[PDB]
Design a binder for this molecule. Structure first.
Ligand SMILES: Nc1nc2c(ncn2[C@@H]2O[C@H](COP(=O)(O)OP(=O)(O)O)[C@@H](O)[C@H]2O)c(=O)[nH]1
Ligand SMILES: Nc1nc2c(ncn2[C@@H]2O[C@H](COP(=O)(O)OP(=O)(O)O)[C@@H](O)[C@H]2O)c(=O)[nH]1
Lengths: 429, 99, 429
C-alpha cells in the first residue's frame, strides 16, 4: 500500500527525474533492463511504492513524463535507465512552449492536459491505497510553470485529500537564465499557494556553491548538480520504503511542518557532504551530521537562515544510530540558538530515524526546514515583477494569448499577501 | 508613444455540429494571428475533427442560435460561443447547455 | 454434434474467410495439405464442428464460397491454405456484380442461388445435429449485399429454427469506398432485420485506428486488418470447441443478448491487443483484460459507446483464470459506470469462460456488446440515403433491373422504424 505517482514536466523536470530514477533503482537494485539483482529481501518488501510488477519479474516505474516538444524526451529514452519507462507514459506535444507561461497554461496546455489525465487516472486506479502524488518542475520555464501548474489545478479537483508536493527550482538571484522569469514565477506561486500541500524551494545558485565550497568539484555538470536533489527527494520518503525505529512519511511531515495552510514553502538540505580527498579526515558520527545541516553553507535555497526564524524543522536520519544521541543534538542546537527559532512553538524539531543507509555511506541525514528567511526569496521576485510590469514590457506576448492585466494584478497582490504573513509571524510573542 | 494598440485575443468558443458531447476549445482569435477570415478556417480543420465528425471538414460557421452565416472576423465578438458546421443544413440541438 | 456451416460471399467475404480458416487450422493443428499434426487429444474431440473427416485422415472445411466473377476465387485457391477447400464448393458465375445491388439480388442473383442451395442442402443433410449457420459478407459491395441477403431469405424458408449470424462490414463514416454504398446498405439492413438472429457490425475505420493507436503498426495491409476479425469470429464459438468452466455457444448468446427481435445489431471487441515492443511493459491479468475491453478505443464499429446505453454485454474469456476474479471485475465496471448501462435490465453482463487460450497468448477475452450507440450508425446511412434519393440520382441503374420506387420507400421507412426504437428504449424507466 501507500503508493506514489511521480509526475515530471518540462526540460528541467525530466533531467531531475532521469537522475532520480537512477538513484531509486540503485537502492532497490534494479538493472537498466528492468529485472532484479538484489541480495536481501528488504528491497522487495516495499517495492510497490515506486514500481508496478510487470509480467516476467520486471518492475517498471510509476512515472508520467510531460513535455511540449519531443527534444528532451528523445534524450531520456536513449540514456541509461531510459529503457525502463513504459513507452505509453511519454506524453509529448509537437508545438513547443516557446518559454512562455501563457503558451504553457492556456493555449497549448489545454490541448494536452486532456491526454495527460488519461494516464494519471489509469495509474491512480491501479494502485491499492494511494498515498499521494509528487511533481518535479521549474518555475523559470514555460512547460514546468504553465503545464506544471495546470496539472495541479485539475488533480486537486479530482483528489481533494491526497497530498501533492512539488520539487520546484526557484530562479537564482544573481544570474538569470530567462529574461521573463519574474513573470513565469509570479504567475506560478499564485497557483501553488492554493493547490499544493508542501513545496520544496531549490535555487540553482545554492547548488553551485556546494559543489565549489563543500564538495570541491572542478567541473560540475548537471549530472553532479541533479544528483544532490535526487538524494534529497529519496531522503524524504526513505522512512516509507524501509523499516525504522521512528517512522515518518509524506503525511506526518505535512502535519508537523505546516502550521498555517499558506506557509508551506520549505528549504531542503542534505548531509553528509564530503570532498573527494577530505572524506578520510572526518568521523561519521551524529554530532557531525548535526552541525553540517544547520549552517548556512549547506542549504539549497539562496537565502541565509540567520535573517529569519525557523518555524518547524524536520530531520530525517538514516542508518543505525542511538536515539539518545539524536535526541540530545537536536535539543542542544535549540537551546543555544534560542533566538533563531520561534517562541510561540515549543519543541519545533521533528525527528525521523530509518534503518538502511544510502548505497555507499554508513549513515546519512536529510534536512527539511521551514523558515521566515524565504521572505527574501519572494521580495526579489516581487521587486523584479513590479520593475518590469510598471513599464508593461514583455506583455504583448501574454495579452495576445487571451489574458488581461487583472490576471497580473491579482497575482502580485497575492504575493504581497504572502510576504505580509512571514513578516507577521516572525515578530509574534 | 510606445504602449501600442493593445493587440488582444478574443476568447471565443467553438462547438462542433451535431456532436452533443463536446465543450469547445477557447482560441486566441486576434488580428495578429489571422490576416484573413479564410486563414481562421484552416486552424479549425485539425483541432475539431479527430476521428468522428465533419466529413466535408470546416466550411460554414453558424451562430449559437443560429441564423446568421458568419462573414469576416469583424462579424465576430468577444466572449460568445459559436457552432462550427460544414454544410448548408443546420442541426438544432442545445450546444451551450452544461459548459 | 452441433455443427456450423460457413458461407462466404463477395470479394470481402472471401478475404475474411481465407484468413479465418488459417486461424481455425492453427488452433486445431491442420497443415495446408489437410492432415493433422497436433500434440494433445483435445484438438480432435470437437473437430466435427468446422471439419468433415475425409478418407485417409484428412479434414476438409465445411465452407461454401460464393462470387459472381472468378477473379477472387482464383486468389483463394492459389494462396496458403487454399488447397484445403473442396473444389466443388467454389461456386462462381461469369457475369459479375458490377458493384450493384439489383444485379446481385434480382438479375444475376437468381441465376446462381439455385446452384448454391444444392451445396447448402448437401452439407446440411450430412451433419448429425446442425447448430446453425454463419455468413461473412459486406454491406458496401454488390455480391455481399445482393447475393448475400438473397441466400438468407432462401435459407430461412427452409430452416426456420436454426440460428443465422452475419459478420457484416458496415461502411465507414469518413471515407467512402463506393459511391452508391448508401443504397447498398439501406437495401440490405431491410433484409437483415427480418431474416437473421444476430448481426456483428464492423467498421473499417475503427480497425485502422486499432492498428495505428493500439498495435502501432507502420504498414497495416489487409492481412493485418482481417486477422483481428478472424480472432473475434473464433472467439465467439470457442466455448463450443473446447471444454470450459462456464460454457456458452451460439444459442446462449442469441438468448442473453437479444431482448427484442429487431434489436440484434452488436459491436465486437477483442482483448488483449499489445504493441510489438510494449508487450513486456504489461501484466496479463483479468483486471487488465477488463479495462481494455470497455473503453472506446478498442471497439470495431466507428461509434463511441458513451453516446448511448448498453442493453446487454457478453464477455467470452479464454484461458485458466479464477472465477471470483472475473465475477468481481464485471460487477465493478457496472456499479461505477451506472449511467452508461440501462435501468430496466438488472445484471446485464453475460460471462463465458473457456479453458484453452489462442495460440501464442496465455489468456484472452472477446467482447460482444449490444448498445444504443449504433443509432448513430443508422442515422448516417439514412441521412446519406435521403440526400441521394431526393434528387433520384444513381437510380436508372436500379430501375432498369426491374425495380420501383416503393422498394426504396419501404426500405428507408423500415430504417426510421429502427432508429425510433433505439431512441425509445434509451430513455425508459
Ligand atoms: N538543476 C537543474 N536545473 C535545470 C536543468 N536544466 C534546466 N534547468 C533549469 O530550468 C530552467 C529553464 O527552463 P526549462 O528547463 O527549459 O523549462 P521549460 O522552458 O518550461 O521547458 C532554468 O531555471 C534552469 O536552471 C538541469 O539539468 N538541472
Ligand atoms: N476488412 C476488409 N474489407 C475489405 C477487404 N476487401 C474489401 N473490403 C471491403 O469490401 C467493400 C467493397 O466491396 P466488395 O468487397 O468488392 O464486394 P462486392 O462488390 O459485393 O463483390 C468495402 O467496404 C471494402 O472496405 C478486405 O480484405 N478486408
Amino acid at each position: 500500500m501507500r503508493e506514489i505517482v511521480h509526475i515530471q514536466a518540462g526540460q528541467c523536470g525530466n533531467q531531475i527525474g532521469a537522475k532520480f530514477w537512477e538513484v531509486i533503482s540503485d537502492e532497490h537494485g534494479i538493472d537498466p533492463t528492468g529485472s532484479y539483482h538484489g541480495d536481501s529481501d528488504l528491497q522487495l518488501e516495499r517495492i510497490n511504492v515506486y514500481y508496478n510488477e510487470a509480467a516476467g519479474n520486471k518492475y517498471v516505474p510509476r512515472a508520467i513524463l510531460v513535455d511540449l516538444e519531443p527534444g528532451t524526451m528523445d534524450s531520456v529514452r536513449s540514456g541509461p535507465f531510459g529503457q525502463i519507462f513504459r513507452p505509453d507514459n511519454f506524453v509529448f506535444g509537437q508545438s513547443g512552449a516557446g518559454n512562455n507561461w501563457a503558451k504553457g497554461h492556456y493555449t497549448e496546455g489545454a490541448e494536452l492536459v486532456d491526454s495527460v489525465l488519461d494516464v494519471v487516472r489509469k495509474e491512480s486506479e491501479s494502485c491499492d491505497c494511494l498515498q499521494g502524488f509528487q511533481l518535479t518542475h521549474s518555475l523559470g520555464g514555460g512547460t514546468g510553470s504553465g503545464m506544471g501548474t495546470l496539472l495541479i489545478s485539475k488533480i486537486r479537483e479530482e483528489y481533494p485529500d491526497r497530498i501533492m508536493n512539488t520539487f520546484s527550482v526557484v530562479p537564482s538571484p544573481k544570474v538569470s537564465d530567462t529574461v521573463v522569469e519574474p513573470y513565469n514565477a509570479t504567475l506560478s506561486v499564485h497557483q501553488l499557494v492554493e493547490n499544493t500541500d508542501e513545496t520544496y524551494c531549490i535555487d540553482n545558485e545554492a547548488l553551485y556553491d556546494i559543489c565549489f565550497r563543500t564538495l570541491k568539484l572542478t567541473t560540475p555538470t548537471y549530472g553532479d548538480l541533479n544528483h544532490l536533489v535526487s538524494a534529497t527527494m529519496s531522503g524524504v520518503t526513505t522512512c516509507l520504503r524501509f523499516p525504522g525505529q521512528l517512522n515518518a512519511d509524506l503525511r506526518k511531515l505535512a502535519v508537523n511542518m505546516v502550521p498555517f495552510p499558506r506557509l508551506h514553502f520549505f528549504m531542503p538540505g542534505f548531509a553528509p557532504l564530503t570532498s573527494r580527498g577530505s572524506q578520510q579526515y572526518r568521523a561519521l558520527t551524529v554530532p557531525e551530521l548535526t552541525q553540517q545541516m544547520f549552517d548556512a553553507k549547506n542549504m539549497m535555497a539562496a537565502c541565509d537562515p540567520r535573517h529569519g526564524r525557523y518555524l518547524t524543522v524536520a530531520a530525517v536520519f538514516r542508518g543505525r544510530m542511538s536515539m539518545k544521541e539524536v535526541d540530545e543534538q537536536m535539543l542542544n542546537v535549540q537551546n543555544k540558538n534560542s533566538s533563531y527559532f520561534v517562541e510561540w512553538i515549543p519543541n519545533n524539531v521533528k525527528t525521523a530515524v530509518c534503518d538502511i543507509p544510502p548505497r555507499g555511506l554508513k549513515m546519512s541525514a536529510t534536512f527539511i526546514g521551514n523558515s521566515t528567511a524565504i521572505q527574501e526569496l519572494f521580495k526579489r521576485i516581487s521587486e523584479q515583477f513590479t520593475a518590469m510590469f510598471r513599464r508593461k514590457a514583455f506583455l504583448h506576448w501574454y495579452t495576445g494569448e487571451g489574458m488581461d492585466e487583472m490576471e497580473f494584478t491579482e497575482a502580485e497582490s497575492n504575493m504581497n499577501d504572502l510576504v505580509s504573513e512571514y513578516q507577521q509571524y516572525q515578530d509574534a510573542t | 508613444q510606445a504602449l501600442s494598440n493593445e493587440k488582444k485575443a478574443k476568447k471565443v468558443r467553438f462547438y462542433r455540429n451535431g456532436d452533443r458531447y463536446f465543450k469547445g476549445i477557447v482560441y486566441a482569435v486576434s488580428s495578429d494571428r489571422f490576416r484573413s477570415f479564410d486563414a481562421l478556417l484552416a486552424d479549425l480543420t485539425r483541432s475539431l475533427s479527430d476521428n468522428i465528425n465533419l466529413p466535408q471538414g470546416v466550411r460554414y460557421i453558424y451562430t449559437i442560435d443560429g441564423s446568421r452565416k458568419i462573414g469576416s472576423m469583424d462579424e465576430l465578438e468577444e466572449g460568445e460561443s459559436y457552432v462550427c458546421s460544414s454544410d448548408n443544413f443546420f442541426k438544432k440541438v442545445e450546444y451551450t447547455k452544461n459548459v
